[PDB]
Structure formats: C-alpha cells, structure tokens
Ligand binder design. Structure first.
Ligand SMILES: CCCC[C@H](NC(=O)[C@H](C)NC(=O)[C@H](CCC(=O)O)NC(=O)[C@H](Cc1ccccc1)NC[C@H](CC(C)C)NC(=O)[C@@H](NC(=O)[C@@H](N)CCCNC(N)=[NH2+])C(C)C)C(N)=O
Lengths: 99, 99
C-alpha cells in the first residue's frame, strides 16, 4: 500500500510464527528484531546505529511476513529499541520511497 | 521521484548555505545533521537509536531543501554518523512508502 509519514510506518510482521509490530526503516541497511527465540542457526554480528554499536545474532534466510508480504532473508536479533525492517527485506517486498 | 531501496536512499540537501548528502530515513522521527556551525539559538536534546544516545543541538524553523524540495522545520545538529532526514521533514516534501 502507500504509507504516508505523519505517523511511524509501523506494520505487523510474523516471524518464528509469532506476530510482532515493526517499523519500515529506509535508514536501516539491515533488519533488527528485539531479543526473541528464533528457529535456526545464528552467527554473532556487531551493527551500528546513531548511538553506537551493539552485538546481535545474525540469522540468515529467515522467513518473515511483513504487512502480508513474504520475505526470506537475514534477520538480526538483538537489543534494538524497536523492531525494524531494513532495506534487505524492504527490497524483497517491492517497497520504494516516492515524492 | 521514486527511490528504490537497493542502495541507501541518499539525496542532496541544502541547509545553512551548504550542500550535503543526507539519508531519507523513515525510521527517524527527527532530522539530524552532521556537526555544522549553524547560527541562531537552540536547546540541548538527546536522541537515541541503535547503540544509545547522542547529544544534539535543536534548531527550530530551519529551512532545508531536500532533493530540490523546500521544507522548514526542526533540525538537530550533533555527532551523527550520517545526515538523516526524518519524518518531520519527509512529510513536508510529500514522501511516501509504497509497496
Ligand atoms: C559486517 C557488516 C555488518 C552490518 C553493519 N551495518 C550497519 O551497522 C548499518 C550501517 N546500520 C544501519 O543501517 C542502522 C540500522 C541497523 C542495521 O541496519 O544494521 N541504521 C540506523 O541506525 C539509522 C541511522 C544510521 C544509518 C546508517 C548508518 C548509521 C546510522 N537509524 C535508525 C533508527 C531506527 C530507530 C527506530 C531505532 N532511527 C534513529 O536512530 C533515529 N531515532 C529516532 O527516530 C527516535 N528514537 C527519536 C530519538 C529519541 N528522542 C528523544 N529522546 N527525544 C535518529 C536517527 C534520530 C555494519 N556496521 O557493521
């Protein structure tokens, strides 16, 4: 759909069979989800944001539904202030910025 | 225009008489520009994201041109790793997320 930006672009996602709310973040290269149990093997990764760097668990090829759209890709799990859907998955659902 | 998300959505902006590259960030409530000697008064603010918080100076009614589109609003100036155009200004240029 078309999402304006007067409110945070929050969407419902389904990951690991669990529903969550996440923010479509064009400023995120990656997808970072709050600490949770996720089925699959993972690798320790460090990612940076506005305030610094954090350690995350990198899960590859994770199936996730974002606003009713399917994406299968890298999901980082860690102490992020909010669940964020980055460009790696936004490109999968055909999301573009327009003005 | 339409901006795909294969790459970081960087656009040219003009603020305080300077041209800079900024990231269109739908996950940013506010706009934060790299440290620059902007005149006028401001008030201290702390903004956070992945990794923690950074202290910035908050300037109100700052005019910024984003990819040729004029906007006027609140701009935070501080030690940000990249110039970020948030929702407060993206709404002014009529930017939407589409998929
Ligand atoms: C081996 C490579 C591994 C990959 C790894 N990649 C990264 O770290 C890349 C660059 N990081 C990013 O792209 C990260 C997101 C995490 C991620 O994608 O991994 N992006 C980001 O963190 C971008 C800004 C940014 C972009 C690029 C570089 C640096 C910074 N911000 C994302 C973020 C989303 C938010 C909901 C948590 N928004 C914000 O941080 C903004 N914050 C907000 O909008 C609010 N929290 C308001 C602040 C609080 N207000 C207050 N106290 N009154 C801020 C910019 C004003 C590399 N570093 O190591």
């Amino acid at each position: 759909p078309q999402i304006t930006l007067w409110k945070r672009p929050l969407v419902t996602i389904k990951i690991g069979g669990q529903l969550k709310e996440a923010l479509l973040d064009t400023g995120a290269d990656d997808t970072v989800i709050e600490e949770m149990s996720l089925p699959g093997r993972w690798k320790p990764k460090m990612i940076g944001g506005i305030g610094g760097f954090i350690k995350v668990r990198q899960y590859d090829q994770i199936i996730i539904e974002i606003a009713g759209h399917k994406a299968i890709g890298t999901v980082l799990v860690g102490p992020t202030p909010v669940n964020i859907i980055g460009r790696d998955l936004m490109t999968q659902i055909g999301a573009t910025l327009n003005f």
